Design a protein around this ligand. Structure first.
Ligand code: PC1
Ligand code: NDP
Ligand code: ZMP
Ligand code: 970
Ligand code: SF4
Ligand code: SF4
Ligand code: SF4
Ligand code: SF4
Ligand code: SF4
Ligand code: K
Ligand code: ZN
Lengths: 205, 176, 41, 156, 114, 48, 291, 95, 43, 208, 340, 103
């Protein structure tokens, strides 16, 4: 933050660069930082809480103008809040087991596989066949640090998924690139490719 | 539960306005950046002297594969093919037959190291700890077929690295 | 109207991109998969 | 002989000058680009060996194929390799560039980058560690050191 | 059997779009041979476009040839703009394959393929 | 291993060989099984 | 069932038995369900498997060193739901999830047994039955089950012609077919003939019939002599099993003339025995007093 | 117990060696056929038959959770040793 | 048991805040140094 | 039922049942089924001529406000006659919920493009042309987005096999990367892992 | 016939073709394209390489896993020749130098090494040996190249009687020494020719046709002991051939006759080099040697190979040697040459 | 050099993840999610884990959930270090790249 936030060369490359309005950010399927740079108050760890994000305390950085610089400050403050959550989880770590103790779902421990019979059958059948999943379609979405990472997983009832659609943030962000680079030069399109954190493994699948 | 990044209305008295004008003309934050760079000039950099030093690892590390043996010479692979039923790359080719003393052993245990994803489902699915994914990561080659490990090369990795793999499993088998 | 009347054979052999080599020289087999006698299910 | 001794010393000289100043090019494709960056990180640090990036193919000695070679970027990799001046080398990094890896049976992956370009060093991993990638670059240096250019030139 | 059309009501507009697509290819092929600097002539490229249009010339369904016009216009859209490369254009010209033996006795000799 | 040495076995190499690739001591793969279909050996006497 | 063990004890160990070179027997893995004994008592009809002992020591076996060899002795590999009776030739070679189950037909006998040839990486691993209610209900014989390794030995793989000294030398297909057709074109009328063997399908039989009718030869023979006198092979009624194999379920008197159906059509004898056991089939044999 | 085939090539523990006319020996021209010379059957033939004073013996390969799963072996035949299925060890009742 | 656990009194507090320490002179003092440099150079 | 069983949310279950009743009686022209899944996610199963009228409701109506098109999905199911099933996933920030608008088509029948409703679909249904072959009429720039340029066929169709019909290799005769008929090093070993005992009695279908 | 050498597959890259070919000198012009056209069938090809290993690296993308075995050899050593050919069922000779060096003359490349390889191929059980002579290789010719090549051809025919000896006339490709040679005399001057280059007649043949002929000679057992003659379908004079090359390359063409006695004195001016020399009097005596016509010998049409003429592939050869001002001129934008 | 139209052609790294998922088991379908967002590895692991656990009607233990949150926030540090430092690399501050990659 000392090297880049106060620096005039960084602000001259990020203040006017790639401004995203609010309703167009909701419209193009932007998620996470691309919404939170545009002032949209949306974080999937606070709105639709999963595993124990209801039992940690952290803040959600909200942008002001939607440029590269406000999304930069959103990412820096999310590193701040990540240090906050890591301090809490290093203080609030409970004792217990690490797999679910339902042995038809998770494999058994090795000392209880090399002694017992049912756990040997379950180790054998979980690593050869696997567990059967009930038939049905789900859409499970998390807040990956880019945005909404989602899996639309349709299962037929067997041990192999029938369909696994992967909603990735960088796909919709690189879609919104076509609006975001209107009226800039070559030297700002590289900053727009930056501020949308485009990792092309999730864009291309 | 939320905060506004970049919502600082600046001070507009003559003091802070003169301070920001001197900050613009006399380049204050540029000297701040130069000071931070010069402060990392005068440290000991974290460059380790490879290959006379090595990177830190842990006994869970997943590198070059190996087939282990009991402490009596007999090999551990009892040819039960879980490690090819769980191998996500399908990088393992197993064929077996009953040998001379009638024990269920392999005759083909191929691991294609250029298919293998080095995730260690084989070393955790093996019910006798036969296949292990050892600590060797410095096993790079110059020809593609040199990375198509058959049973002989995996037994040679096991016999070569057993003094290390047995100690790693001895240090790690209480967490699994 | 906004609806067309097609009385032709339903033919997507030129849209699926599958070559002719594996359309006319393959014998597809439609079958109830027979039960494995090792098991009773 | 004497001329054989001169060309042996010149082979040692020019092979030293070609191995102690390898210039890889910024060519990442997939997850191995992260570990190739970590091989350029402060800890493992390719540049202590004399090994620095140059982004153009015209001014690079080796091309580390870090990541998956799909069926849509086969001609881009081939033309990028072909625009490299001789001598050019290829370090195939990771399992997808070596032999298809985890996407070997898939419809849109070139099953190994040795189909498209000649490969001099195979670095196995998914990803191979930046220390192991550095070991692959050092094995490339041990391959360049035992080149015999002017010896075979004098003996033809 | 009462379904929704895509563009054409029956085979008249379908043959119209097939015919306009072939007009577009016949206009385009010299630009393709020029800017891809291929070693083929314009005559061999137009023979190949003729072969690609007579490969699918047995369709009687208007929706199927509507989608074939759509896919041909996508091929045209990616050929006019330089989005394809020399390899993508030359993949129609099967230069590197061994010539597949057609008669029965050679197919008997070289393998089990019917 | 001079304070806590690893446990010695009757088969562990006391001669650690390095990465032998490129040298004549290197590794060459091959199929480890045997011939599947045993072909017919014709007789050594004529049919007359 | 559940997913862990409360059995904090030491398990039993049962002695293995020796009942032939077909069924590898490890009686530790048995659960004493007695499909062995009801199979060998009702369908195989041997009455030489049983339960010895009493309590948790009840060993299912033969009680002596007796080699259980029936005509259907392999099907105790099928119906045993545990691994106490596995196939001894198939033993250790394969594993069922990777086997490709090609549904095929037995040719060892004229019963016409629906089977599954299950393969792996381009090699036949084992042969199992299919459930077909009128032929091979869900059984096969031991010849059908265990004649898969003779299928992969002694195979004619290349065309072989006579060299200058009368030895069989390997050659191409062009030379072998040319040297056959050179003598084929020099034959006309009854100068060329054919002998149809044992395992030959109707496609090949009608192929060779059309080829020897282009030469105009009707000398096309089979190994198994059927008498052509009277109607001969013209009407289909006098060379079939005209009722059905299923019709033995309906019958009450089955006369067997000059045959031994235990070894020739073994599952047809299994159908005669199931009609004998259940539908009270009255059987008479004219011939040698076989078992 | 490695031996040499009449083509000059070492035999594996499976029984794999290329014959005289097989061209696939050419991949070993100038290089070496990497085989293991510590055969499993030879190193387990050396191990003694363990005399135990129980009818049913429990084998686990040694090490507890570091070996094979613990199986129970019957030892009634005095003709035949009770061979463990996984580890190749074999037992005998001493009376 | 013997498991990876945090210590009984917890850990120390971890700072996570912005600390840009506000170093440097004032504006008027920097212009005073600059104008004094110009006047000494001119003399 | 405490430790290893996922706890049930009857509140979102009841609220999505009530909102499904609401949507099914607002739109009787296209909404064909409404189902609340057992883990409290609503599925509004509509007719393919109702892509524009339904999704404009959910984007605009003051009781729905499904502002963001999160995910768009086709699921090829070959045992139907309308084998493709376009799945819309909608996120509503104000009411903080998700809805699933599922509809159907076969190959030849087009689906009306929803870029007039959600601009986010500008690529997503484009992917459905590239992967499945569902044509979307009245789309701005519809073409392939993911596969190779000279790629024939649609990949995620289940009649299309795992490995395709073309492989690539560099060829030094013609100095060109060429596409040839595929010959694998190893065949893809298919595993028949379906255990023939009935796994779930609550998902048994009635017989013929 | 062994089971592993039985052909399988569709004849693609990962098929099995049943050819085990040792291609001597597979690093040069014909060897590059021959390993290309063998590796697309699935042949266990042995490449014996003399040179730097790096110069053979472009032979690695030409086949499947392990189908190409690279191994060292020396020309004056029958040990490595026996080590390389003893597992091959076909040996192909592509050893040649268009100039003489210090360590090897024309004789050691065309008489000693081909007879050495043919004798060792006889005494190792090889089914087919193939030697590649030149169409003008005669005992009574003016260049030492052609005389040594005819002597070595007669030796190979008298030491391996079933050797297929193939006569290419003048092969042109992307890496040739025929059309690139004719396009590299805009550097020296105005492409000088003996007797205006009008008294010599040529017919060049394209390398894909020669490679298809060599492989169809490997496949067909009708090639045992034969002597093929691969020629182009159209004959050319030298003068309008060079003028056609300079019109396809779109260059200023101003020819001038350099006499028969003073052009070998320029031929000695370039062969004083320890490098690869630019030209020599042997290349002069071979360009100014007309292609003989051998009707009693078979050609490409006696192997089921349709010969490709020059006007289809000269553009493919000569698009490199153009400037930018006519870099993308089409194939039809040039006048065809005058056949004789 | 002003920008009029941007058309991003993608699919140069398309490998067919979500067709290979259909032919492998769930435990085998997990390591694709390491390789989608390869700077957010355990995040995608957690997302697929929550998907399968939502279908299975089972929940993790408490310690597993707190370990998931701990390494998810370490993963959040990883992805934002990658984002910020390579965005400063693409703009030109190539130095905090090297300063933060020791972390
Ligand atoms: C030769 C010896 C060494 C020389 C010095 C070496 C060390 C210093 C170099 C530091 C690193 C610089 C790296 C590159 C930086 C690039 C950015 C940059 O330079 O931006 C320029 C910046 C640009 O500022 P800006 O772009 O932020 O401006 C704000 C503009 N708006 C509001 C529209 C956004 O500053 C200047 O242009 C300053 C020019 C020189 C100032 C000279 C002041 C003279 C004062 C005289 C007295 C005034 C008092 C009143 C009158 C009294 C009369 C007596
Ligand atoms: N224009 C043409 O190309 C024509 C050629 N031919 C004939 O075809 C054959 C091959 O020609 P071409 O490919 O063009 O020639 P090249 O120069 O391209 O290749 C010849 C090969 O022979 C090897 N070689 C030559 N001399 C020696 C030696 N003393 N020791 C070891 N290796 C040696 C070279 O090895 P290295 O790489 O180490 O130098 C090289 O690989 C020759 O017999 C030639 O006469 C016939 C008609 C036309
Ligand atoms: C440079 C090379 C690039 C190659 C590009 C290849 C493009 C391929 C596009 C394919 C488009 C089609 O196949 S649509 C054509 C098929 N249409 C039909 O079969 C309908 C019937 N068509 C006909 O009868 C056609 O002959 C005509 C021309 C429409 C009319 O003929 P009839 O009248 O007498
Ligand atoms: C120059 C140094 C010291 C580093 C930075 C760097 C490399 C090598 C290669 C690349 C690179 O950075 C650029 C930009 O950032 C990513 C990020 C990527 O993924 C997050 C990615 O994936 C393919 C590729 C890239 C580029 C890439 O190829 O070495
Ligand atoms: S570590 Fe490699 S061999 Fe083992 S299961 Fe994973 S991919 Fe397969
Ligand atoms: S390595 Fe282990 S899991 Fe694989 S077959 Fe051998 S004993 Fe079984
Ligand atoms: S070899 Fe594997 S881990 Fe490496 S870049 Fe490829 S997909 Fe990613
Ligand atoms: S059929 Fe199997 S389980 Fe049943 S009694 Fe026989 S051996 Fe035991
Ligand atoms: S697979 Fe079945 S029979 Fe075999 S040991 Fe396990 S439970 Fe017993
Ligand atoms: K059984
Ligand atoms: Zn044991």
């Amino acid at each position: 933050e000392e090297m880049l936030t106060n620096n005039r060369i960084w602000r001259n490359r990020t203040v006017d660069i790639g401004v995203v309005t609010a309703e167009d950010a909701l419209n193009y399927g932007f998620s996470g930082v691309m919404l939170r740079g545009s002032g949209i108050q949306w974080d999937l760890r606070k709105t639709q809480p999963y595993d124990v994000y209801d039992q940690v305390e952290f803040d959600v950085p909200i942008g002001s103008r939607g440029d590269c610089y406000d999304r930069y400050l959103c990412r820096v403050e999310e590193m701040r809040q990540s240090i906050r959550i890591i301090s809490q989880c290093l203080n609030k770590m409970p004792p217990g087991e690490i797999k679910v103790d339902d042995a038809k779902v998770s494999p058994p421990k090795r000392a209880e596989m090399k002694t017992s019979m049912e756990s040997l059958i379950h180790h054998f059948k979980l690593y050869t066949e696997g567990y059967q999943v009930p038939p049905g379609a789900t859409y499970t979405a998390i807040e990956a640090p880019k945005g909404e990472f989602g899996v639309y997983l349709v299962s037929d009832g067997s041990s192999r998924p029938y369909r696994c659609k992967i909603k990735a943030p960088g796909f919709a962000h690189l879609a919104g690139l076509d609006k975001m680079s209107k009226g800039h030069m070559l030297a700002d399109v590289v900053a727009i490719i930056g501020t949308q954190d485009i990792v092309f493994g999730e864009v291309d699948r | 539960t939320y905060k506004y990044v970049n919502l600082r209305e600046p001070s507009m008295d003559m003091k802070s306005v003169t301070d920001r004008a001197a900050q613009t003309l006399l380049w204050t934050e540029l000297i701040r950046g130069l000071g931070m760079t010069l402060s990392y000039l005068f440290r000991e950099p974290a460059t380790i002297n490879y290959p006379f030093e090595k990177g830190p690892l842990s006994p869970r590390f997943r590198g070059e594969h190996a087939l282990r043996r009991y402490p009596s010479g007999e090999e551990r692979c009892i040819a039960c093919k879980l490690c090819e039923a769980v191998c996500p790359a399908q990088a393992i080719t197993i064929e077996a037959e009953p040998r001379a003393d009638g024990s269920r052993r392999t005759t083909r245990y191929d691991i294609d190291m250029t298919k293998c994803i080095y995730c260690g489902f084989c070393q955790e699915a093996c019910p006798v700890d036969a296949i292990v994914e050892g600590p060797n990561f410095e096993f790079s080659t110059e020809t593609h077929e040199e990375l198509l490990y058959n049973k002989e090369k995996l037994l040679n990795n096991g016999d070569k690295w057993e003094a290390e793999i047995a100690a790693n499993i001895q240090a790690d088998y209480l967490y699994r | 109207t906004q609806l067309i009347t097609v009385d032709e054979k339903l033919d997507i052999t030129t849209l699926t991109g599958v070559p002719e080599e594996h359309i006319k020289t393959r014998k597809a087999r439609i079958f109830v998969p027979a039960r494995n006698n090792m098991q009773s299910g | 002989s004497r001329g054989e001794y001169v060309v042996a010393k010149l082979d040692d000289l020019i092979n030293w000058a070609r191995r102690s100043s390898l210039w890889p090019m910024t060519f990442g494709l997939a997850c191995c680009a992260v570990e190739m960056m970590h091989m350029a990180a402060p800890r493992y640090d390719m540049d202590r060996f004399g090994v620095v990036f140059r982004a153009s193919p015209r001014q690079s000695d080796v091309m580390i194929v870090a990541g998956t070679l799909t069926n849509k970027m086969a001609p881009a990799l081939r033309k990028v390799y072909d625009q490299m001046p001789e001598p050019r080398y290829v370090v195939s990094m990771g399992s997808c560039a070596n032999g298809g890896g985890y996407y070997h049976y898939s419809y849109s992956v070139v099953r190994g980058c040795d189909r498209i370009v000649p490969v001099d060093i195979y670095v196995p991993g998914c990803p191979p560690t930046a220390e192991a990638l550095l070991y692959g670059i050092l094995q490339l240096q041990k391959k360049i050191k035992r080149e015999k250019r002017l010896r075979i030139w004098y003996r033809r | 059997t009462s379904v929704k059309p895509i563009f054409s009501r029956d085979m008249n507009e379908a043959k119209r779009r097939v015919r306009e697509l072939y007009r577009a290819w016949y206009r385009e092929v010299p630009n393709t041979v020029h800017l891809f600097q291929l070693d083929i002539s314009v005559k061999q490229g137009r023979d190949k476009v003729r072969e690609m249009f007579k490969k699918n010339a047995h369709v009687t369904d208007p929706r199927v040839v509507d989608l074939l016009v759509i896919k041909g216009k996508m091929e045209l859209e990616e050929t006019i703009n330089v989005w394809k490369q020399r390899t993508h254009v030359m993949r129609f010209f099967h230069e590197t394959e061994a010539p597949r033996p057609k008669d029965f006795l050679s197919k008997f000799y070289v393998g089990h393929d019917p | 291993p001079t304070v806590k040495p690893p446990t010695a076995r009757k088969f562990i190499w006391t001669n650690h060989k390095f990465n032998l690739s490129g040298t004549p001591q290197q590794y060459v793969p091959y199929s480890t099984t045997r011939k599947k279909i045993q072909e017919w050996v014709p007789p050594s006497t004529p049919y007359k | 069932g559940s997913d862990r063990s409360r059995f904090l004890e030491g398990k039993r160990a049962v002695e293995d038995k020796n009942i032939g070179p077909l069924v590898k027997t490890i009686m530790t893995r048995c659960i004493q369900c007695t499909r062995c004994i009801r199979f060998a008592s009702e369908i195989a009809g041997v009455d030489d498997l049983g339960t010895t002992g009493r309590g948790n020591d009840m060993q299912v076996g033969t009680y002596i060193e007796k080699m259980f060899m029936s005509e259907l002795s392999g099907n105790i590999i099928d119906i045993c739901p545990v691994g106490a009776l596995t196939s001894k030739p198939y033993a250790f070679t394969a594993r069922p999830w990777e086997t490709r189950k090609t549904e095929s037909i037995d040719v060892m006998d004229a019963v016409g047994s629906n089977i599954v040839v299950s393969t792996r990486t381009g090699e036949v691993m084992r042969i199992l039955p299919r459930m077909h209610e009128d032929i091979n209900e869900e059984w096969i014989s031991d010849k059908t089950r265990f004649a898969y390794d003779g299928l992969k030995r002694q195979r004619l793989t290349e065309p072989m012609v006579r060299n200058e000294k009368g030895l069989l030398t390997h050659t191409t297909w062009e030379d072998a077919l040319s040297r056959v057709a050179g003598m084929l074109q020099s034959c006309q009328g009854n100068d060329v003939a054919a002998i149809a063997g044992g395992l030959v399908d109707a496609e090949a039989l009608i192929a060779l019939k059309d080829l020897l009718n282009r030469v105009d030869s009707d000398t096309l023979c089979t190994e198994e002599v059927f008498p052509t006198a009277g109607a001969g092979t013209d009407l289909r009624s006098n060379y079939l099993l005209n009722t059905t194999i299923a019709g033995v379920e309906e019958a009450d008197v089955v006369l067997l003339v000059g045959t031994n159906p235990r070894f020739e059509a073994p599952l047809f004898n299994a159908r005669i025995r199931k009609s004998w056991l259940h539908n009270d089939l009255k059987v008479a044999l004219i011939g040698s007093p076989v078992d | 117990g490695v031996r040499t085939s009449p083509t000059g090539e070492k035999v594996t523990h499976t029984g794999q060696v290329y014959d005289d006319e097989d061209y696939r020996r050419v991949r070993f021209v100038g290089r070496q056929k990497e085989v293991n010379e510590n055969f499993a059957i030879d190193l387990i033939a050396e191990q003694p038959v363990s005399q135990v004073g129980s009818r049913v013996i429990s084998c686990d390969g040694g090490g507890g959770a570091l070996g094979h799963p613990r199986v129970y072996i019957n030892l009634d035949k005095e003709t035949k040793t009770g061979t463990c299925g996984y580890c190749g060890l074999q037992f005998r009742q001493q009376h | 048991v013997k498991q990876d656990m945090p210590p009984v009194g917890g850990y120390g507090p971890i700072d996570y805040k912005r600390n840009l320490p506000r170093r440097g002179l004032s504006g008027y003092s920097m212009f005073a140094v600059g104008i004094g440099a110009l006047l000494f150079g001119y003399w | 039922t405490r430790p290893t069983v996922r706890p049930r949310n009857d509140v979102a279950h009841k609220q999505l049942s009530a909102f499904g009743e609401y949507v099914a009686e607002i739109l009787p022209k296209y909404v064909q089924q409404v189902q609340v899944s057992c883990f409290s996610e609503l599925e509004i199963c509509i007719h393919p001529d109702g892509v524009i009228p339904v999704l404009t409701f959910l984007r605009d109506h003051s009781n729905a406000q499904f502002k963001s098109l999160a995910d768009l999905t086709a699921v090829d199911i070959p045992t139907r006659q309308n084998r493709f099933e376009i799945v819309y996933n909608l996120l509503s920030l104000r009411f903080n919920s998700r809805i699933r608008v599922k509809t159907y088509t076969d190959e030849l029948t087009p689906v009306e493009s929803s870029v007039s409703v959600y601009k986010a679909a500008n690529w997503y249904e484009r992917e459905i042309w590239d992967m499945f072959g569902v044509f979307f009429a009245n789309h701005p720039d519809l073409r392939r987005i993911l596969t190779d340029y000279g790629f024939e066929g649609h990949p995620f169709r289940k009649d299309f096999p795992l490995s395709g019909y073309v492989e690539l290799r560099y060829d030094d005769e013609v100095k060109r990367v060429v596409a040839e008929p595929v010959e694998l090093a190893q065949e893809f070993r298919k595993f028949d892992l379906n255990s023939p005992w009935e796994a779930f009695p609550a998902y048994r279908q009635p017989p013929e | 016939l062994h089971h592993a050498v039985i052909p399988h597959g569709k004849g693609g890259r990962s098929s099995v073709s049943g050819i085990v070919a040792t291609v001597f000198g597979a690093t040069g012009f014909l060897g590059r394209y021959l390993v290309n056209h063998l590796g697309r069938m699935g042949s266990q090809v042995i490449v014996p390489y003399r040179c730097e290993p790096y110069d053979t690296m472009h032979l690695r993308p030409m086949g499947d896993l392990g189908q190409i075995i690279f191994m060292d050899w020396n020309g004056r050593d029958k040990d490595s020749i026996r080590r390389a050919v003893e597992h091959s069922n076909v040996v192909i000779n592509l050893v040649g130098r268009e100039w003489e060096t210090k360590n090897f003359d024309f004789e050691d490349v065309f008489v000693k090494i081909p007879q050495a390889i043919a004798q060792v191929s006889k005494e190792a059980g090889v089914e087919k040996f193939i030697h590649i002579s030149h169409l003008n290789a005669d005992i009574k010719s003016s260049s030492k190249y052609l005389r040594n090549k005819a002597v070595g051809e007669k030796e190979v025919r008298e030491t391996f009687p079933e050797a297929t000896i193939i006569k290419p006339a003048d092969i042109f490709g992307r890496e040739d020494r025929f059309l690139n040679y004719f396009a590299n005399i805009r550097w020296f001057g105005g492409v000088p020719l003996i007797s205006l280059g009008k008294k010599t007649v040529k017919q060049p043949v394209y390398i894909v046709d020669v490679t298809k002929g060599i492989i169809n000679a490997i496949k067909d057992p009708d090639a045992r002991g034969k002597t093929f003659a691969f020629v182009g379908p159209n004959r050319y004079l030298l003068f309008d051939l060079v003028q056609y090359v300079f019109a396809v390359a779109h260059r200023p063409f101003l020819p001038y006759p350099m006499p028969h006695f003073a052009y070998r004195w320029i031929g000695r001016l370039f062969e004083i080099s320890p490098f690869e020399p630019w030209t020599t009097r042997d290349k002069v005596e071979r360009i100014h040697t007309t292609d003989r016509t051998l009707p009693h010998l078979p050609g490409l049409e006696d192997l089921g190979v349709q010969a490709t003429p020059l006007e289809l592939k000269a553009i493919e050869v000569l698009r490199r040697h153009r400037t930018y001002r006519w870099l993308s001129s089409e194939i039809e934008d040039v006048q065809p040459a005058k056949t004789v | 050099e002003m920008v009029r139209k941007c058309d991003p052609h993608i699919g140069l790294l398309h490998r067919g993840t979500e067709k290979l998922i259909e032919y492998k088991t769930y435990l085998q379908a997990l390591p694709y999610f390491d390789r989608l967002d390869y700077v957010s590895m355990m995040c995608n692991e957690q997302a697929y884990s929550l998907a399968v656990e939502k279908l299975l009607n089972i929940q993790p233990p408490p310690r597993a959930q707190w370990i998931r949150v701990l390494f998810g926030e370490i993963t959040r540090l990883l992805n934002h270090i990658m984002a910020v430092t390579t965005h400063a690399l693409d703009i030109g501050a190539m130095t905090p790249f090297f300063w933060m990659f020791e972390e």
